Structure formats: structure tokens, C-alpha cells
Amino acid sequence: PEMVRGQVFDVGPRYTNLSYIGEGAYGMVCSAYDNVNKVRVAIKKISPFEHQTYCQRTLREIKILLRFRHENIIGINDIIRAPTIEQMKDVYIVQDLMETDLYKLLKTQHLSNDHICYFLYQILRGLKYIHSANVLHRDLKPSNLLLNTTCDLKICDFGLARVADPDHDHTGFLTEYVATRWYRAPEIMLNSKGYTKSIDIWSVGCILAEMLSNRPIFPGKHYLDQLNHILGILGSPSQEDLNCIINLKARNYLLSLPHKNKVPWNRLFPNADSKALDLLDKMLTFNPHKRIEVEQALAHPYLEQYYDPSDEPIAEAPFKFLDDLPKEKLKELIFEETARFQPG
Numbered sequence: 001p002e003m004v005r006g007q008v009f010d011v012g013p014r015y016t017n018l019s020y021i022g023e024g025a026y027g028m029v030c031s032a033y034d035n036v037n038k039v040r041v042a043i044k045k046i047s048p049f050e051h052q053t054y055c056q057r058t059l060r061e062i063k064i065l066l067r068f069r070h071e072n073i074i075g076i077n078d079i080i081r082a083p084t085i086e087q088m089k090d091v092y093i094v095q096d097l098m099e100t101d102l103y104k105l106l107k108t109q110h111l112s113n114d115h116i117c118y119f120l121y122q123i124l125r126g127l128k129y130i131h132s133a134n135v136l137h138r139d140l141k142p143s144n145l146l147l148n149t150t151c152d153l154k155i156c157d158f159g160l161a162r163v164a165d166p167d168h169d170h171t172g173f174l175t176e177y178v179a180t181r182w183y184r185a186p187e188i189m190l191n192s193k194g195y196t197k198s199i200d201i202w203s204v205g206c207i208l209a210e211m212l213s214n215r216p217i218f219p220g221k222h223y224l225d226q227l228n229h230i231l232g233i234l235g236s237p238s239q240e241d242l243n244c245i246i247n248l249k250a251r252n253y254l255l256s257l258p259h260k261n262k263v264p265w266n267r268l269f270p271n272a273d274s275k276a277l278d279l280l281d282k283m284l285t286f287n288p289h290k291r292i293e294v295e296q297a298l299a300h301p302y303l304e305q306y307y308d309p310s311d312e313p314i315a316e317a318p319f320k321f322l323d324d325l326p327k328e329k330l331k332e333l334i335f336e337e338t339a340r341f342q343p344g
């Protein structure tokens with residue numbers, strides 16, 4: 001076994017010469033030399049089995065990424081694990097190695113309008129595919145957009161992804177939520193579980209705003225502060241949009257706030273392309289029913305140089321598809337889902 005920053009990386013024979021990339025709550029990630037394909041690759045050691053939510057997140061990701069095949073979505077190339085459930089303490093997911101991500105690029109680089117346009121196109125092209133499979137990503141943010149040296153973009157991290165379920169989207173006011181705060185649509189805080197495709201478009205809107213200025217547009221410091229950052233730019237919701245929020249706690253909270261005027265996009269983003277700002281406005285619409293959909297966004301004049309629906313593929317096999325399952329049962333499902341990659 002090779003060691004990396006303490007940890008064992010039981011990934012040989014196939015994968016050697018490991019360099020440390022990073023580490024998080026998920027696991028540890030390295031680059032490794034693939035000896036069959038003669039390329040360096042990413043490998044993330046996941047150790048989810050002692051907690052049911054980490055098994056949940058791991059299995060969703062595996063199932064989704066093995067079904068999907070798209071240029072703007074990270075694939076799974078290989079999965080390494082022990083030959084028996086008993087011996088399986090870790091799963092290693094092998095993926096194409098990307099040079100950087102949009103979070104790192106935005107901290108260090110001014111993006112040209114042409115780069116913003118091309119990144120946004122790629123995000124939306126990937127998202128068209130995801131949404132065409134009846135899947136929601138639910139945690140779109142700069143660090144989940146991987147980039148290579150030629151600026152090709154791939155969406156990653158499907159641990160919070162769900163099949164869309166718009167008939168069960170309603171919930172109460174101030175319902176707790178898992179996905180990254182700064183990219184949460186206003187309705188999350190008001191009346192939504194994040195089970196509709198509109199949740200992802202809001203996040204993409206936030207990302208486009210962040211590309212224009214290198215700063216997050218709505219950096220809330222805590223749950224309700226996120227909503228009031230949103231309302232500080234969008235201004236007070238209209239009567240019509242208020243009347244769609246039937247829950248009284250949520251509605252009366254909004255009614256209690258002083259009137260706030262909209263901050264014009266062209267004052268927040270004085271150097272931005274006007275067509276970029278028109279698309280931003282439509283993605284960052286308060287009412288999720290009025291919010292632009294992914295295929296409409298692709299057809300927007302800002303993206304005219306790239307738009308080609310014949311070259312913006314959809315999924316062949318959408319998900320028709322568990323939240324109750326014990327971590328011991330989810331290990332079993334993870335074992336089964338990864339069996340195709342074993343010697344056999």
C-alpha cells in the first residue's frame with residue numbers, strides 16, 4: 001500500500017505514484033497515475049460506512065454518475081473496493097483529473113466576458129442533461145464546477161442530488177436545509193424543500209453573478225440572513241408573488257419588512273454585458289414559477305454564439321426513482337452498485 005498524509009490508499013496495482021490534492025469531510029482526494037490508460041486521474045477515498053447520511057450521499061452519487069454520460073458532467077471511470085462486504089471499509093471512486101475549479105479560479109483570476117459566456121454555456125448544457133433525467137443537483141456552486149487547462153467545465157458532487165418531486169415541494173417557514181447557504185433560492189427559507197428544477201437555476205444565477213464580480217452576490221452569515229441579502233438586491237416581492245406564498249408565517253414575515261427597492265443589475269455590475277444581465281435577472285427571479293428554465297436559458301441571446309440544441313443532449317434513461325434505509329442496508333446497495341468494476 002502507498003500512504004498519503006498518513007492514510008492508506010489501497011488503490012494498486014492499477015493506480016500508482018500518488019500526489020496529495022486535498023481533503024474534506026467526504027474523504028481524501030489524490031491524483032494517481034493510471035497504468036492501464038497511462039494518464040493521471042483523481043481518486044477519492046470515501047469512508048462512509050459508520051454513518052447513514054454519508055452512505056446516502058455516496059450511493060446517490062454512484063448511481064447517478066454511473067447512469068449519466070455527458071461532456072459537462074464528471075464521470076466515474078473505476079470504483080475500487082474490497083471483494084467482500086465484510087472486508088469493505090472504504091470505496092475509492094476514480095474520476096478524470098481536472099486542473100482546478102471555479103471557486104479557486106474566481107479567487108485568483110479576472111474572467112473575460114468570453115470566459116463567462118463559455119462557462120455559463122457549459123454549466124447550462126450539463127444542467128439540461130441532469131434536469132432531462134428528472135434529477136436535481138441541489139448544491140451547484142463554484143467549487144462543484146471543475147475546469148481543465150483549456151477551460152472545459154464539468155459538474156461534480158452529486159451527494160445532495162434528488163429525483164425531482166414538485167408535488168411534494170411545500171414546507172413551512174424556516175425549515176432547515178442542507179445545501180450551501182449562499183446559493184439557496186429564497187423559497188428554501190419560505191416554503192420549499194428544494195424538490196423542483198427551479199432550485200438549481202437560482203444557484204446558477206448566483207454563480208453567473210459571482211463570475212461577473214469575483215464575489216458571492218448573497219453571502220448570508222446564517223439561515224435567515226441569506227433571505228434578507230436576496231431581498232436587499234431584488235427588493236420587496238410584489239403582491240402577486242406574495243400571494244403565491246400561502247403559508248401565513250412566511251407571508252407575514254415578508255409583509256413585516258420595510259419596503260425595499262430593487263438594486264439595478266447594471267449598478268452592481270457596471271462592466272457586465274447587458275445580455276448577461278438580462279439572463280441574470282431571469283435566473284434570479286424571486287418567484288420560482290416565473291424563473292427561467294434551463295432550456296430557455298440556453299436559448300437566451302447572451303448564449304447565441306454557442307446555442308445549438310442538436311448538440312445539447314438529453315438523458316436516454318431518466319430516473320423514475322431511499323431515505324429510510326439503515327447504513328448496513330446502504331453498504332449492501334453500495335457493494336452491489338460497484339460490482340461491475342471488480343475483476344470478473
Ligand SMILES: CN(C(=O)CN1Cc2ccc(-c3nc(NC4CCOCC4)ncc3Cl)cc2C1=O)C(C)(C)C
Nearest residue numbers: 026029042057058061095097098099100101156157159
Ligand atoms: C461529498 N462527496 C464528494 O466526493 C465531493 N467531492 C469532493 C471532491 C474533491 C475533488 C474532486 C476532483 N477534483 C479534481 N481536481 C481538483 C484539483 C485541485 O483543484 C481543484 C480541483 N479533479 C477531479 C475531481 Cl473528481 C471532486 C470532489 C467531489 O465530488 C461524496 C463523497 C460523493 C458524498
